[PDB]
Amino acid sequence: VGEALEYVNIGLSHFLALPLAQRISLIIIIPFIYNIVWQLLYSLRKDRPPLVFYWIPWVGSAVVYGMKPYEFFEECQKKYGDIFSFVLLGRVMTVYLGPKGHEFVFNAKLADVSAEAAYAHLTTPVFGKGVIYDCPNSRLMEQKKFVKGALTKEAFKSYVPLIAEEVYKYFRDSKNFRLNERTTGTIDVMVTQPEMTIFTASRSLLGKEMRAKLDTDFAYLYSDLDKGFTPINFVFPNLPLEHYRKRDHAQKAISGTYMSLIKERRKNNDIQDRDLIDSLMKNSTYKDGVKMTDQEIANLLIGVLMGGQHTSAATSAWILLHLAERPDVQQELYEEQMRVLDGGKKELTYDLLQEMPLLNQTIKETLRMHHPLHSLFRKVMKDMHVPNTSYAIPAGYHVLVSPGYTHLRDEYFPNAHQFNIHRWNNDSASSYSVGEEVDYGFGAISKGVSSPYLPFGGGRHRCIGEHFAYCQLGVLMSIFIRTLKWHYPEGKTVPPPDFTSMVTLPTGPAKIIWEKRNPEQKIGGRHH
Numbered sequence: 001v002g003e004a005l006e007y008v009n010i011g012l013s014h015f016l017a018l019p020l021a022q023r024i025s026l027i028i029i030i031p032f033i034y035n036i037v038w039q040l041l042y043s044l045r046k047d048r049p050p051l052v053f054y055w056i057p058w059v060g061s062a063v064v065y066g067m068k069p070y071e072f073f074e075e076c077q078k079k080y081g082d083i084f085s086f087v088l089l090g091r092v093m094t095v096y097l098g099p100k101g102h103e104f105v106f107n108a109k110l111a112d113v114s115a116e117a118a119y120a121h122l123t124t125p126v127f128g129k130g131v132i133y134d135c136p137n138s139r140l141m142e143q144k145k146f147v148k149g150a151l152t153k154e155a156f157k158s159y160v161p162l163i164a165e166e167v168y169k170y171f172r173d174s175k176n177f178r179l180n181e182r183t184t185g186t187i188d189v190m191v192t193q194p195e196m197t198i199f200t201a202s203r204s205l206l207g208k209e210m211r212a213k214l215d216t217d218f219a220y221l222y223s224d225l226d227k228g229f230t231p232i233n234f235v236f237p238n239l240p241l242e243h244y245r246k247r248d249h250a251q252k253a254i255s256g257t258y259m260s261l262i263k264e265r266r267k268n269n270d271i272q273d274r275d276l277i278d279s280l281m282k283n284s285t286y287k288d289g290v291k292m293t294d295q296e297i298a299n300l301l302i303g304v305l306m307g308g309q310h311t312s313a314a315t316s317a318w319i320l321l322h323l324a325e326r327p328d329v330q331q332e333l334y335e336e337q338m339r340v341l342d343g344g345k346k347e348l349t350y351d352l353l354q355e356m357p358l359l360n361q362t363i364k365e366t367l368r369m370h371h372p373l374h375s376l377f378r379k380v381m382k383d384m385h386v387p388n389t390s391y392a393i394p395a396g397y398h399v400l401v402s403p404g405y406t407h408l409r410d411e412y413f414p415n416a417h418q419f420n421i422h423r424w425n426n427d428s429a430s431s432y433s434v435g436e437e438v439d440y441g442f443g444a445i446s447k448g449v450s451s452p453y454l455p456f457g458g459g460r461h462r463c464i465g466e467h468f469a470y471c472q473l474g475v476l477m478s479i480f481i482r483t484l485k486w487h488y489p490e491g492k493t494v495p496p497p498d499f500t501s502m503v504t505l506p507t508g509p510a511k512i513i514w515e516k517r518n519p520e521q522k523i524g525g526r527h528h
């Protein structure tokens with residue numbers, strides 16, 4: 001054998017003397033083969049959930065996942081059931097589909113999984129520091145407690161006329177509408193809905209100063225910060241290219257603006273309750289006694305607005321697109337508007353919004369068929385055992401939960417692919433805890449997360465903007481419905497979703513034709 005141990009040696013030297021043709025050829029075929037072999041070996045573990053097969057190492061199933069994630073999920077579900085892992089741009093994602101999925105990931109022990117470990121690389125470049133996913137979970141919990149303290153029923157009662165004012169101003173002044181000079185037109189909902197979202201959100205959460213700056217060049221900074229919030233930040237987070245530093249410019253620029261306004265409200269004492277900025281100023285002292293720096297506060301503002309911008313605008317687009325081919329639902333929604341607002345002689349209020357169940361059902365149903373975030377991740381911190389199986393999810397893996405996939409399942413939603421607001425009759429609540437509650441720092445929320453309809457997640461990371469979004473979407477749709485009818489151009493229909501972005505947007509252009517319900521109606525106020 002010693003004459004073979006000489007030969008491993010010899011053979012080794014001859015490898016180092018291959019032409020660079022075969023050397024490069026080998027540095028690609030050696031890893032390709034080991035990859036394929038490791039998988040076959042992997043499939044013989046019985047404490048591991050089935051791993052989706054793939055050819056290209058590191059990249060894994062990222063193509064099909066990234067492009068059509070629900071269909072990926074469905075085919076995986078058919079060959080392996082509800083638990084399966086797949087590889088994604090260097091990471092291993094264990095997907096648990098269905099309500100026990102929600103349970104296993106949303107109700108995971110703090111010690112078992114990390115949300116900030118998963119998200120901070122995407123969000124921190126964008127929002128700034130010391131906030132959201134750039135702090136310990138405990139801090140997050142109190143930050144949510146803060147924000148949510150400006151998301152009160154009385155807050156909502158002041159925001160509603162402000163939001164309405166913005167919609168009306170938008171109809172009057174935007175080149176997309178100009179209702180005072182045109183009775184009909186075509187809009188890209190993907191153009192209109194983002195401006196409407198930022199305008200209304202800005203004016204209400206950030207106040208009238210901050211809204212006004214959007215009428216200037218300053219608005220482009222929101223657009224710059226916007227582009228840095230993209231999945232590419234997951235694999236290539238900081239690359240010395242130009243989109244990355246207009247991003248960082250904007251983060252600095254916008255944050256500075258808030259601090260400018262923050263500090264000068266304190267150097268006066270223009271501290272009321274008008275907006276979230278007032279609120280966070282009066283209310284951002286942690287339980288251990290620390291106060292949020294002005295910088296942190298501002299970064300928390302950026303985060304809050306960013307999160308409500310994309311989800312809400314997408315939902316707003318989808319509502320318009322689904323209704324554009326359902327003049328019966330527009331008709332139904334309009335009658336409810338007339339009955340609740342007494343033919344329009346009542347002014348819209350947060351209270352009156354709550355008495356529009358069909359309106360809220362449309363929001364509800366849209367959020368069902370078009371959940372904004374098709375995937376939520378965690379990273380596993382301790383080996384997790386999955387009941388009732390032999391599976392251990394080893395630390396360093398990622399768990400992926402996808403309530404939006406469950407939303408589109410016939411098992412839990414009869415005719416799941418049919419837009420039907422009436423599947424929610426006598427049931428228009430944004431959401432409700434259907435049993436016992438629990439509190440993590442920002443208020444009592446559902447303890448069980450087994451509801452097959454989970455648009456806002458659950459557990460410690462559960463959303464806190466649900467009521468803001470229904471408020472915004474409510475006022476928005478109330479006014480669209482009372483002002484306009486709208487339909488598709490010839491042979492157009494509901495676009496299919498673009499899953500590749502951070503949010504599941506419709507595939508643009510998604511155009512609708514509007515026409516005034518009342519051609520001779522003039523929106524008041526003044527423009528130049």
Ligand code: HEM
Nearest residue numbers: 307308311312315376455456457461462463464465468469
């Ligand atoms: C249609 C609108 C929205 C939908 C469908 C939605 C959905 C969600 C979901 C699924 C989560 C949980 C994320 C996870 O567990 O990994 C979440 C979290 C959160 N959302 Fe929303 N959201 C919406 C709007 C908003 C708005 C308007 C705001 C703020 C004004 C907001 C702020 C937040 C915050 C602060 C969290 C906490 C995240 C954490 O603790 O990790 N969201 N949202």
Ligand SMILES: O=c1c2cc(F)ccc2nc(-n2cncn2)n1-c1ccc(Cl)cc1Cl
Nearest residue numbers: 119122123132303304306307308311373463
């Ligand atoms: O970062 C994320 C986020 C990151 C992901 F990788 C996936 C989904 C996400 N979903 C949300 N949102 C949930 N509601 C609104 N946005 N946020 C997020 C969470 C909290 C805040 Cl303040 C802002 C954002 Cl964008």
